[PDB]
Amino acid sequence: GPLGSMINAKTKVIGLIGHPVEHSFSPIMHNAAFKDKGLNYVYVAFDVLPENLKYVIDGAKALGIVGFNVTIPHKIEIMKYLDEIDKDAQLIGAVNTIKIEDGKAIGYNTDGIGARMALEEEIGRVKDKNIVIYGAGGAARAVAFELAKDNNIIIANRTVEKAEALAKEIAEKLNKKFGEEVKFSGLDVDLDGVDIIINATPIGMYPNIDVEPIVKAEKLREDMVVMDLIYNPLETVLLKEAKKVNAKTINGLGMLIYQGAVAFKIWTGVEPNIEVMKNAIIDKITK
Amino acid sequence: GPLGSMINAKTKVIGLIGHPVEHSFSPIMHNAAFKDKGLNYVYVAFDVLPENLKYVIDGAKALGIVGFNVTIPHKIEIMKYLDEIDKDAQLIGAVNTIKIEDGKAIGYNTDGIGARMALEEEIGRVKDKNIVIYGAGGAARAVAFELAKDNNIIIANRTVEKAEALAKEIAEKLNKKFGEEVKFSGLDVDLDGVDIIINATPIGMYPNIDVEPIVKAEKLREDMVVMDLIYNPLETVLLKEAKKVNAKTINGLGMLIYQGAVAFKIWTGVEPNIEVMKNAIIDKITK
Ligand SMILES: NC(=O)c1ccc[n+](C2O[C@H](COP(=O)([O-])OP(=O)(O)OC[C@H]3O[C@@H](n4cnc5c(N)ncnc54)[C@H](OP(=O)(O)O)[C@@H]3O)[C@@H](O)[C@H]2O)c1
Ligand SMILES: NC(=O)c1ccc[n+]([C@@H]2O[C@H](COP(=O)([O-])OP(=O)(O)OC[C@H]3O[C@@H](n4cnc5c(N)ncnc54)[C@H](OP(=O)(O)O)[C@@H]3O)[C@@H](O)[C@H]2O)c1
Ligand SMILES: [Zn+2]
Ligand SMILES: [Zn+2]
């Protein structure tokens, strides 16, 4: 059909709350998915200052706004304003998706599932495997809490203290063996027997793209899968290093899209077309 | 440009708050005008219950919603949640347009001005004439207050004292003579010598378009002007009753557009294109 949202008096609103948000690809992505499925919703971006976060939930309820996506710096602070919080959300300790229904605002977190789907949808079910997660920030945290449910994960980081702390919280909360199922280490850890490595750090991300990868070619193999959460540029210096060894590369586009796909489902009750989302976003990145 | 609205992460939101709002044509009017001017705004409708009205302004301020239009039944109750209210809306006692600026919510009322422009574009300056206004709601208030500035008016309503109350109030604030310049009566007031009559009541408005007109063609006259504030249908019963006496008829299209046009300017600092607003509405009303 036509390009752009065909708005009328019955159109429902969904928005992204954060500060700043003017560069999010979310609106573009979701509006295309709404059209495709013929749903009468619109996605907009709301720049919310920290002191005003306390007024959004009751405003959304009063207005009839159906839901939100939450990003920096509100995913931790928004939790005290919601009526309920999904377990998967309570575990990670952060909300990035909200649904308002029947006067009840519920928090969710799809960053975890997203990074999983980003993988499975590309290499099938991921259970009982050796997975190394470089980084320990918000991304590595959501990823880890999800892939640790049924996999052996090793959180490697520049500041080990951070790695150790995360591995303990995961083993504890998910009830796993510390030094075995949920390990930690420096960025030096070796990949002998490692099935998949996931880069959850900004190394190689624009504007510092010409820096050396999180791991040289020497430790890379073909029998591996190297996914990079970065998506600017899509093919990082890490994926190059992994291409000179026929490894199955996956760029950040996967997590970004699927993370949204699950939220879409939560708001509309319908599954969105993954290619529409990608084509809308990938077209935004390139000319 | 595109057929629908091309939303991005910078698009600003303007909404209509009221109950109900599903059959409003305002979103149609304004989005059409936004696009024609290349402005990055989207106009949507919010269904707000009277009990939740108190959470909307802080919500709007929090999210960065730049303005609203206010319709039944919040035109008066919203005044207590605003920071400032301009002269007109304060005299009139009702707010139909809001603008959030510098963390400050301001109330305006474009109804009155809208009605005069629509009436004056049709028959030239309206001054020193006898005008009857049927009704006493927010619209009647706006139009009565505005035309009472330089014309003799008579407020006719089913609830007489309610019309008496409004007449006294107008005479009071405009330094007018309660007995002559501003009168009141029931729905059967004699129209001899009356130059213009305006229907500021829902009688005849969709979907109940077969009811009895607020005044029989008996009192109508060929050299009389009959304006109905209803725009859906485009030709109410009152107007086709007026046509059977060759009287000059005017529907509510002009008031709707001119009222919106003034609000448009207020939110954006830009003057919208009238033909665009006008035709966008007609096309959604007719076929
Ligand atoms: N595709 C998607 O769906 C998606 C979703 C979310 C984020 N991303 C992104 O994911 C990546 C990760 O970041 P984040 O925002 O989640 O968290 P974050 O707060 O940026 O996490 C910081 C991480 O970066 C490390 N790090 C930073 N500079 C480093 C360097 N020069 N050398 C070694 N380690 C370094 C930190 O080790 P320390 O703590 O010790 O500094 C830590 O592990 C980013 O590149 C960003 O582009 C993609
Ligand atoms: N075209 C435009 O720019 C524009 C702008 C604003 C409003 N409108 C509209 O203007 C019209 C007026 O209403 P409002 O929203 O301003 O105020 P309101 O709050 O709806 O005021 C109620 C009015 O309706 C009367 N009324 C209702 N049903 C009646 C009936 N069946 N018989 C006799 N009288 C009846 C009341 O007399 P009582 O109080 O005694 O009941 C009173 O005058 C509506 O039809 C609405 O669609 C058009
Ligand atoms: Zn800031
Ligand atoms: Zn309707």
Curated annotation (Swiss-Prot), chains A, B:
Pfam families: SDH_C, Shikimate_DH, Shikimate_dh_N
Known EC number: 1.1.1.25
A GO BP entry: aromatic amino acid family biosynthetic process
Positions bound to shikimate: S24, F25, S26, T71, N96, D111, Y231
Molecular function terms, GO-annotated: NADP binding; shikimate 3-dehydrogenase (NADP+) activity
Keyword annotations from UniProtKB, A to Z: Amino-acid biosynthesis, Aromatic amino acid biosynthesis, NADP, Oxidoreductase
Keyword Amino-acid biosynthesis: yes
Annotated positions binding NADP(+): 135-139, 157-162, 201, 205, 229, 252
Cross-referenced SUPFAM superfamilies: Aminoacid dehydrogenase-like, N-terminal domain, NAD(P)-binding Rossmann-fold domains
Gene3D superfamilies reported in the protein's UniProt record: Leucine Dehydrogenase, chain A, domain 1, NAD(P)-binding Rossmann-like Domain
Keyword Oxidoreductase on entry: yes
Membership in a protein family: Belongs to the shikimate dehydrogenase family.
HAMAP family: Shikimate_DH_AroE
Name of the molecule in the record: Shikimate dehydrogenase (NADP(+))
Native organism taxonomy: Archaea, Methanobacteriati, Methanobacteriota, Methanomada group, Methanococci
